[PDB]
Design a protein around this ligand. Structure first.
Ligand SMILES: COc1ccccc1-n1nc2c(c1C(C)C)[C@H](c1ccc(Cl)cc1C)N(c1cc(Cl)ccc1OCCN(C)C)C2=O
Ligand SMILES: [Cl-]
Length: 95
């Protein structure tokens, strides 16, 4: 819809700050798929309860490493294209 299914198959190498976050939720490796990166970031948000309990579409991250990563104090989980750009700040695509 917003995102082609093929995007999930993209292979990526996280930069240090993203790697730091991923290591708190998932197995370390040099190269991830975007399916993996997205899953792990989602799990990070859920475990650390960075979403508004009463307004669950909004992630609040100004008091968290995630805010440094994404460069925003908050965002909506519905804004998928924006999320991909924020993630892409922090990785290199490998091919
Ligand atoms: C605070 O959020 C919630 C609270 C309660 C329930 C759900 C959610 N919640 N909603 C969504 C997410 C979550 C959490 C974080 C897993 C993730 C998502 C959002 C942000 C990031 Cl960085 C990573 C992921 C996986 N996400 C999303 C983002 C993109 Cl760019 C592409 C597809 C996505 O999901 C498609 C639907 N899926 C459930 C199968 C959503 O639409
Ligand atoms: Cl933190």
């Amino acid at each position: 819809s917003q995102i082609p299914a093929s995007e999930q198959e993209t292979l990526v190498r996280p930069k240090p700050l993203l790697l730091k976050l991923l290591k708190s939720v998932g197995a370390q490796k040099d190269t991830y798929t975007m399916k993996e990166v997205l899953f792990y970031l989602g799990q990070y948000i859920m475990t650390k309860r960075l979403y508004d309990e009463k307004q669950q579409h909004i992630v609040y991250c100004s008091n968290d490493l995630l805010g440094d990563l994404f460069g925003v104090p908050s965002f909506s989980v519905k804004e998928h294209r924006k999320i991909y750009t924020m993630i892409y700040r922090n990785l290199v695509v490998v091919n």
